Amino acid sequence: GATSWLDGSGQIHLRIYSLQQSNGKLLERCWDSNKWYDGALTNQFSAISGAGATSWLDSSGQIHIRVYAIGTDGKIIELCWDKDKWYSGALTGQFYGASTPDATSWLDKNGQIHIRVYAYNQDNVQKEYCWDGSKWYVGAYTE
Amino acid sequence: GATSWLDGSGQIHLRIYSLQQSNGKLLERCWDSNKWYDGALTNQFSAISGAGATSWLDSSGQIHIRVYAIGTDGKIIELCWDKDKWYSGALTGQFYGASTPDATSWLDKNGQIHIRVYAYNQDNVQKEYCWDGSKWYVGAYTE
Amino acid sequence: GATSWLDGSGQIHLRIYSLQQSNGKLLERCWDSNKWYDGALTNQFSAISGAGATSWLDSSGQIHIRVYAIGTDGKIIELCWDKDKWYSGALTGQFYGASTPDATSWLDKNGQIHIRVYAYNQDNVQKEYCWDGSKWYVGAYTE
Amino acid sequence: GATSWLDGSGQIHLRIYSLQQSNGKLLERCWDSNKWYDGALTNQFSAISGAGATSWLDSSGQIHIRVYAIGTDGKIIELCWDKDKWYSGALTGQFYGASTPDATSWLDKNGQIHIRVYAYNQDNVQKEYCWDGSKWYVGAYTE
Ligand SMILES: CO[C@@H]1O[C@@H](C)[C@@H](O)[C@@H](O)[C@@H]1O
Numbered sequence: 001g002a003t004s005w006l007d008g009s010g011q012i013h014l015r016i017y018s019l020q021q022s023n024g025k026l027l028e029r030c031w032d033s034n035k036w037y038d039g040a041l042t043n044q045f046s047a048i049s050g051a052g053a054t055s056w057l058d059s060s061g062q063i064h065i066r067v068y069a070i071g072t073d074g075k076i077i078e079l080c081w082d083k084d085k086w087y088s089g090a091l092t093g094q095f096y097g098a099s100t101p102d103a104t105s106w107l108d109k110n111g112q113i114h115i116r117v118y119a120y121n122q123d124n125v126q127k128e129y130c131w132d133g134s135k136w137y138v139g140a141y142t143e
Numbered sequence: 144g145a146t147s148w149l150d151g152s153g154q155i156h157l158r159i160y161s162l163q164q165s166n167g168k169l170l171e172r173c174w175d176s177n178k179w180y181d182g183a184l185t186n187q188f189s190a191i192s193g194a195g196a197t198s199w200l201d202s203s204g205q206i207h208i209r210v211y212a213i214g215t216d217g218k219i220i221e222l223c224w225d226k227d228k229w230y231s232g233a234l235t236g237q238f239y240g241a242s243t244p245d246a247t248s249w250l251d252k253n254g255q256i257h258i259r260v261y262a263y264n265q266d267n268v269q270k271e272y273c274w275d276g277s278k279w280y281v282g283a284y285t286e
Numbered sequence: 287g288a289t290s291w292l293d294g295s296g297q298i299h300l301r302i303y304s305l306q307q308s309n310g311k312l313l314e315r316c317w318d319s320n321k322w323y324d325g326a327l328t329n330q331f332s333a334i335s336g337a338g339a340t341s342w343l344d345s346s347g348q349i350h351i352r353v354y355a356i357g358t359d360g361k362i363i364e365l366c367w368d369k370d371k372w373y374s375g376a377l378t379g380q381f382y383g384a385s386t387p388d389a390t391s392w393l394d395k396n397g398q399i400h401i402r403v404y405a406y407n408q409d410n411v412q413k414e415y416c417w418d419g420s421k422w423y424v425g426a427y428t429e
Numbered sequence: 430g431a432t433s434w435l436d437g438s439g440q441i442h443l444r445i446y447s448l449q450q451s452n453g454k455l456l457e458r459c460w461d462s463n464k465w466y467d468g469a470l471t472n473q474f475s476a477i478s479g480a481g482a483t484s485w486l487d488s489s490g491q492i493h494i495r496v497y498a499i500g501t502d503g504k505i506i507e508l509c510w511d512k513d514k515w516y517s518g519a520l521t522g523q524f525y526g527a528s529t530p531d532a533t534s535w536l537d538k539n540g541q542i543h544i545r546v547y548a549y550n551q552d553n554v555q556k557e558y559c560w561d562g563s564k565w566y567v568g569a570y571t572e
């Protein structure tokens with residue numbers, strides 16, 4: 001997964017997520033100014049796929065990140081950053097996934113984030129999972 | 144791959160890219176208001192991986208989309224939309240890829256797009272390919 | 287998948303199974319003496335993985351072949367050859383598979399074939415499926 | 430990968446090779462009589478794919494095993510057992526691999542092993558690599 005955002009000074013920030021071949025844990029690599037370095041997510045969570053990532057800036061300029069992967073039980077895991085720590089989101093453990101999830105997100109005029117996550121399930125069907133601010137639900141998407 | 148943008152009315156547009164198990168060609172599924180439909184990219188390009196996608200809006204409100212996959216020669220293919228047609232971009236055929244590419248992009252203050260594409264290569268090295276408006280180059284990223 | 291056997295004259299026979307990128311159908315490539323040719327299985331069956339294969343010779347010198355793949359519903363499919371046609375075996379549709387299955391087989395003193403098939407399931411557990419001549423059952427194998 | 434052989438008492442021996450999600454090393458699971466156990470190959474070798482396996486019995490009743498995987502440099506690795514140790518075979522490092530290798534083998538009338546290994550290469554071509562007792566060579570196999 002790759003996600004990026006511009007701060008108020010026009011500096012690009014990159015966050016690159018991958019599954020480490022040597023320990024089965026997600027890696028986060030960060031660029032904030034002039035070099036690559038390790039992110040806090042590194043080595044916290046096991047997965048069995050790569051990760052899809054999306055991010056957004058709130059009205060205060062705080063970055064929010066969401067990372068989606070397949071966990072060690074075959075179900076989608078959601079990892080969240082809002083301020084100062086990674087935590088497992090509400091999506092975690094709800095749905096079986098068979099592919100590296102894709103994700104996109106957008107902010108509406110009220111500052112409510114909307115997220116869409118896409119992954120194959122156990123029946124080889126491409127599914128869309130939707131967040132509009134209350135509960136995850138299965139979307140209308142079909143292949 | 145999933146990408147999305149908001150138009151001037153606050154309507155979300157979704158574009159979801161996937162590799163068809165039946166014919167080895169990329170599918171584009173589109174949402175503009177109230178239903179999913181097959182996009183113009185569908186069946187124009189063969190690949191052997193999934194697709195990473197990024198997009199941006201120019202100052203006129205025109206969407207630009209870039210889609211990255213592994214082609215049938217084992218090399219990264221770049222598919223481009225700027226207005227009314229899909230075409231193969233400058234990145235195509237330069238580098239071997241061994242994983243579904245990730246991509247991100249941002250617009251600088253001068254309206255110049257910057258793109259970063261990430262994929263494993265034939266040597267099992269995670270590589271970053273960078274566009275800043277002239278030529279693709281290998282970036283500083285490492286795991 | 288690859289399987290092979292020696293006939294009574296000491297001639298090698300090779301059978302190589304793969305999933306075609308262009309049509310999502312299994313291909314069988316055959317070697318019996320001096321050239322590769324397309325086997326009868328070719329283009330008959332859709333799958334979403336590669337295929338594992340095993341084979342055995344009965345006391346009359348008749349080859350029997352079993353090929354295992356993930357079907358388009360996410361479940362293991364078994365394709366069988368005993369004499370003159372491919373058919374779907376008893377294993378088909380019983381279990382979810384999340385990996386290209388592996389298979390091995392042996393003949394006991396009474397000429398009864400025993401088959402063992404290994405694949406991850408939807409819960410990311412490596413499973414063994416066993417045939418000893420009556421019904422498929424889940425074996426004692428654990429990772 | 431799965432391989433099996435019958436000893437002189439008619440007892441089945443199973444050897445199941447897999448890539449461990451926890452450490453990126455090959456696991457060998459063994460059945461000789463009444464239980465599964467970890468074999469000596471376990472945790473010796475890193476890989477980035479699953480493993481294909483083949484085995485044969487020599488005239489003394491000694492098993493020989495060959496295991497094929499993609500190593501951490503993107504090239505096929507060959508792991509060999511003839512009596513009492515695993516070692517890297519002559520195929521290791523020669524060819525790029527982009528898929529879990531398949532392998533089969535047969536003994537000719539003189540007791541010379543023949544091995545055939547199949548894997549995609551970096552150019553998305555299915556390749557056959559052949560051993561007849563001197564050097565590995567690219568075979569006539571095509572799709
Ligand atoms: C300040 O912390 C750095 O940036 C945050 C936005 C997160 O990506 C975090 O894991 C990383 O270590």
Ligand SMILES: CO[C@@H]1O[C@@H](C)[C@@H](O)[C@@H](O)[C@@H]1O
Pocket residue numbers: 066078080088089090091113115131
């Ligand atoms: C407030 O809830 C947290 O953030 C939302 C935007 C979602 O990512 C949800 O799954 C998560 O638990």
Ligand SMILES: CO[C@@H]1O[C@@H](C)[C@@H](O)[C@@H](O)[C@@H]1O
Pocket residue numbers: 116128130138139140141155157174
């Ligand atoms: C309102 O419908 C929901 O949101 C739309 C933007 C799409 O993601 C659609 O598939 C989904 O069911």
Ligand SMILES: CO[C@@H]1O[C@@H](C)[C@@H](O)[C@@H](O)[C@@H]1O
Pocket residue numbers: 158171173181182183184206208224
């Ligand atoms: C109007 O055309 C639709 O939208 C464009 C932005 C592209 O996604 C195109 O392939 C699609 O058919």
Ligand SMILES: CO[C@@H]1O[C@@H](C)[C@@H](O)[C@@H](O)[C@@H]1O
Pocket residue numbers: 209221223231232233234256258274
């Ligand atoms: C103008 O060149 C086109 O657009 C750029 C933004 C890049 O995607 C490039 O590879 C492509 O050929």
Ligand SMILES: CO[C@@H]1O[C@@H](C)[C@@H](O)[C@@H](O)[C@@H]1O
Pocket residue numbers: 012014031259271273281282283284
């Ligand atoms: C200027 O350096 C280039 O751009 C940065 C934003 C990073 O993508 C870096 O790896 C790359 O080499």
Ligand SMILES: CO[C@@H]1O[C@@H](C)[C@@H](O)[C@@H](O)[C@@H]1O
Pocket residue numbers: 301314316324325326327349351367
């Ligand atoms: C004679 O038929 C050839 O050999 C048989 C053993 C099968 O492999 C069949 O699919 C193939 O066409």
Ligand SMILES: CO[C@@H]1O[C@@H](C)[C@@H](O)[C@@H](O)[C@@H]1O
Pocket residue numbers: 352364366374375376377399401417
């Ligand atoms: C006789 O039944 C057929 O052959 C056996 C050896 C098994 O492969 C079984 O699943 C298949 O239906």
Ligand SMILES: CO[C@@H]1O[C@@H](C)[C@@H](O)[C@@H](O)[C@@H]1O
Pocket residue numbers: 402414416424425426427441443460
């Ligand atoms: C008797 O046990 C059955 O056969 C053995 C040969 C093993 O395959 C074992 O896991 C299985 O349960």
Ligand SMILES: CO[C@@H]1O[C@@H](C)[C@@H](O)[C@@H](O)[C@@H]1O
Pocket residue numbers: 444457459467468469470492494510
């Ligand atoms: C006796 O040793 C056991 O059997 C051999 C045939 C090999 O599979 C070895 O790794 C394993 O530990």
Ligand SMILES: CO[C@@H]1O[C@@H](C)[C@@H](O)[C@@H](O)[C@@H]1O
Pocket residue numbers: 495507509517518519520542544560
């Ligand atoms: C004697 O050579 C060893 O055994 C042969 C049968 C091959 O597996 C070869 O690559 C390996 O080095």
Ligand SMILES: CO[C@@H]1O[C@@H](C)[C@@H](O)[C@@H](O)[C@@H]1O
Pocket residue numbers: 298300317545557559567568569570
């Ligand atoms: C004699 O030809 C060699 O051996 C045969 C058994 C086949 O493996 C063939 O593709 C290879 O070139």
